[PDB]
Amino acid sequence: LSSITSGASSNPLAKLDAALADVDTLRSSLGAVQNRFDSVISNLGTTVTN
């Protein structure tokens, strides 16, 4: 109700936190990918020697 008296974008603080969460999820998924995608190299190098 406080917004209507001023007319500026009601409930900003909770509106912006979802944006922060959305970027965080993407970053976490990318890091998870990186770890597996590194382990592959270590396996692959050994098999070639054998």
Binding site: S39, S42, N43, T46, T47, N50
Partner: protein, 50 residues
């Protein structure tokens, strides 16, 4: 002399078959190492979630 020759020739190739076996056994171990390394990390992550 003929029956000496026969067994010499047979044994020589029997000697190579063992090398085939050693190579197969050696190759499997490199595969199993990475499985172990992944399980080690899964357990530790599960520790964090309790």
């Amino acid at each position: 002399a003929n029956r000496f020759t026969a067994n010499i020739k047979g044994l020589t190739q029997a000697q190579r078959n063992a090398n085939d076996g050693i190579s197969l056994a050696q190759t499997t171990e490199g595969a199993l190492t990475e499985v172990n390394n992944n399980l080690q990390r899964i357990r530790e992550l599960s520790v964090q979630a309790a």
